[PDB]
Write a protein that binds this DNA or RNA. Structure first.
Length: 207
DNA sequence: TCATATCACCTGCGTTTCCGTTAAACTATCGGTTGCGGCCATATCTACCAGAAAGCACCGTTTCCC
């Protein structure tokens, strides 16, 4: 419970309001990869923040590799500004984080068979083609990947607090699977997602 | 470089289920052609009928007879 989870990847999307010519967009970006022989879209990485991004002719975009809530909106706004420099209106709309990926380490090894046998209502553990166990948390809804080393991965979340709540909910379970710190201090010590996102310009006129 | 989880996608392959196709035995009329019979025309035979010249009966004035 003392080893607070770290975010590894935040993935988001934004609507542009207007349908646009993706070939025209592909002409001016300083990083771009695109070939209709394999896929009909441009892959578009940037230096700072270190995000990858994607654009669709229908007037929608996706952003990946964000380290913070801030990076997600700030990168999306900078990609939209590049499209506004180009011959399109690109009205920044529908900003959302569809998935969050985080990880933590309890520093003790886990008997995945014991976890799967006792919590089989939520746990799945297939024959060992892959070494890690998977867990389906239903309230709040989170997917957790459990490894024998004590390393843990969390995904399927969209709100920051639920990743820390899911870790805190399974830490007592993991701690029971032991043989021969445990205090969270608070459920969420850091500021909320909204108090982070509000540092970035929200108004679409603030290009 | 293979072995899991999760999401945007969109475009693509070629899949996967009830309907459509070529053509069946058995089905429901309905048509090109078969044979079978009414109305109406004709020359002849007939039923129902009246009219004439002639019958014939009811009747009583006559007169001969009770």
């Amino acid at each position: 419970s003392g080893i607070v989870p770290t975010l590894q990847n935040i993935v988001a999307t934004v609507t542009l309001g207007c349908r646009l010519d993706l070939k025209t967009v592909a002409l001016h970006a300083r990083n771009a990869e695109y070939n209709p022989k394999r896929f009909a879209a441009v892959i578009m990485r940037i230096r700072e923040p270190k995000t990858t991004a994607l654009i669709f002719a229908s007037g929608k975009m996706v952003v990946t590799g964000a380290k913070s809530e801030d990076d997600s909106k700030l990168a999306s706004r900078k990609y939209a500004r590049i499209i506004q420099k180009i011959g399109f209106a690109a009205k920044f709309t529908d900003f959302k984080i569809q998935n969050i990926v985080g990880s933590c380490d309890v520093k003790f090894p886990i008997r995945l068979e014991g976890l799967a046998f006792s919590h089989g209502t939520f746990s799945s553990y297939e024959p060992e083609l892959f070494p890690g166990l998977i867990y389906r948390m239903v309230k709040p809804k989170i997917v957790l990947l459990i490894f024998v080393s004590g390393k843990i991965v969390l995904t399927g979340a969209k709100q920051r607090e639920e990743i820390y709540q899911a870790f805190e909910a399974i830490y007592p379970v993991l701690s029971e699977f032991r043989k021969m710190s445990g205090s969270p201090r608070n459920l969420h010590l850091l500021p909320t997602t909204d108090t982070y996102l509000s540092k970035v310009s929200d108004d679409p006129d603030n290009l």
